[PDB]
Subunit: 145 residues, 3 copies
């Protein structure tokens, strides 16, 4: 079985064994979440979303339509994703931009991931980074101060 | 009518037709929100706040006292606003700094807007930007990496 | 007495007189919170956490195991902290990195604080800053654009 906190609103049945979903999360019906994930408090997970096994999503993260997270990924707290490069209110894209975070990658706290991005296997994104270009597998990327 | 999610705490009656306010939002009594807005999950909206029509506020945003959002504005997820330039705990300003986000402007995901800022009509703020100065109408501004 | 909002999940008994904890907060059992604090909506506070007196934590902040906040500190909205410098999903550190935010310091909105950091007494961290090194007492630090 999986653990859905009574204070979460989880509408998806597609949740793997061992997964924990914590307080004040929203998970919409078509989301797919694998086994042994930890979806920490205050997250939002939309419909066209696939999350693999052993994924950690720390607090305050939103996973939009068009985003896939592979197995063993770590997403730091308050990490932000995008599916629309030129957002204008009520101007809905015909197709959302896709992001994929590949197996074992880690995204540091409060990073910002632009739309259409691939982050390669086992990459490490520094805390607070702005990722405007793909990050190669196993690369450590951060936004220099 | 408007749609207030049962899992929101909306204390304002000043909400326009067609507006949606989603799970785990807090809206304090004096907030004014126009028609056909979408206030996504996990937002906080204070009292001295005016939000126009057709405004999109993505998840995880707080709109403080002193902030006005005009019509047709898009605010990306985890965008942060300020009303106090030199904050010190329990040192309450006599007057909060005012921010105005003008008609049709868009603010990218996880941007940070300093206090006292004007963002001009139809401007575009890049994801993750720090906005320390006014942005002119129709300008695209981002914080270079 | 202290004020715990009915829409918060506060599991700690260690909360000082005059403290307010707002909607959609999570506070785990071992957290220590002093007197006259304001823990604004949408915060998460873990177990190995000490927060002093007269502390303001604005919305959307998480205080992890290993973090101490001294008296009279201001933490801006969506400020992010870290306790793991090289995070990998399911690779639990033997010991979390410690952060201390010293008396009277202020952290601007949407700043990112790396693990192992000391922010000195009465320092001021600019909105959106990435703090990768200790900040001396009374220093104003921001990430230049
Ligand atoms: C990116 C990194 C892995 C790099 O660590 P590192 O490779 O040991 O680098 P380092 O020796 O500390 O720093 C090298 C330089 O890069 C800078 N730097 C490191 N991380 C940075 C970041 N996130 N943003 C900007 N600059 C950074 C340092 O200031 C240092 O600069 P100088 O050489 O000018 O002194 C780490 O700093 C980091 O950001 N970790 C993520 C932490 C996190 O977000 N954890 C999740 C939340 S807690 O689970
Ligand atoms: C700012 C922008 C509109 C610019 O798009 P663009 O004008 O097509 O620029 P571009 O050709 O991709 O990039 C030009 C340069 O600016 C850099 N850049 C673009 N956006 C940036 C940003 N947000 N921060 C820092 N640098 C950025 C690029 O890296 C590129 O650098 P080089 O010239 O060195 O390669 C877009 O990148 C962006 O930030 N969009 C907002 C996305 C968002 O937040 N959506 C809301 C959430 S999903 O609804
Ligand atoms: C850091 C600061 C205290 C500095 O204020 P200041 O010392 O009056 O500086 P200033 O005169 O406005 O700016 C000096 C320069 O630093 C830049 N700057 C100021 N704050 C900055 C920031 N946060 N990030 C990047 N650059 C910044 C300005 O753009 C200006 O650049 P130029 O000299 O190139 O014009 C303030 O800008 C700030 O960030 N305050 C925190 C606001 C906040 O987060 N409040 C909490 C939420 S509301 O309670
Ligand atoms: C009990 C409880 C836990 N949680 C979430 C947030 C907690 O940090 C987390 C604890 O689960 P866990 O020990 O499996 O931790 P993880 O989420 O796996 O993260 C820790 O380990 C990582 C490797 C990194 O080091 C990270 N910085 C740590 O926080 O679960 C809630 O959101 N609400 C809760 O009520
Ligand atoms: C069903 C539901 C929706 N919502 C919010 C978050 C959802 O992303 C949003 C869906 O409403 P909508 O289709 O009107 O979307 P908008 O909020 O208008 O945003 C989309 O369109 C923009 C133009 C940009 O492209 C943006 N990146 C998109 O997400 O409503 C909740 O917060 N809780 C919910 O339970
Ligand atoms: C009524 C209510 C308040 N709150 C929180 C968020 C509100 O901004 C805050 C109001 O309490 P307060 O007046 O003691 O304000 P503080 O949290 O102390 O912050 C203000 O004063 C600072 C010095 C800075 O200038 C800051 N930018 C201001 O917001 O309490 C909730 O989260 N939910 C609520 O329902
Ligand atoms: Na943020």
């Amino acid at each position: 079985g999986h653990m859905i906190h009574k204070l979460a609103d989880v509408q998806s049945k597609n949740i793997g064994s061992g997964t924990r979903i914590w307080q004040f999360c929203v998970v919409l019906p078509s989301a797919i979440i694998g086994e042994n994930c930890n979806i920490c408090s205050h997250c939002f997970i939309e419909n066209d979303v696939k999350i693999g096994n052993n994924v950690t999503i720390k607090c305050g993260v939103q996973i939009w339509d068009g985003i896939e997270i592979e197995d063993d990924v770590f997403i730091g707290p308050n990490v932000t994703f995008c599916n629309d490069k030129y957002p204008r209110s009520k101007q809905y894209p015909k197709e959302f931009s896709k992001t994929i975070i590949k197996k074992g990658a880690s995204i540091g706290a409060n990073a910002t991931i632009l739309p259409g991005i691939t982050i390669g296997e086992n990459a490490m994104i520094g805390a607070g980074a702005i990722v405007t270009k793909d990050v190669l597998p196993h690369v450590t990327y951060y936004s220099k101060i």
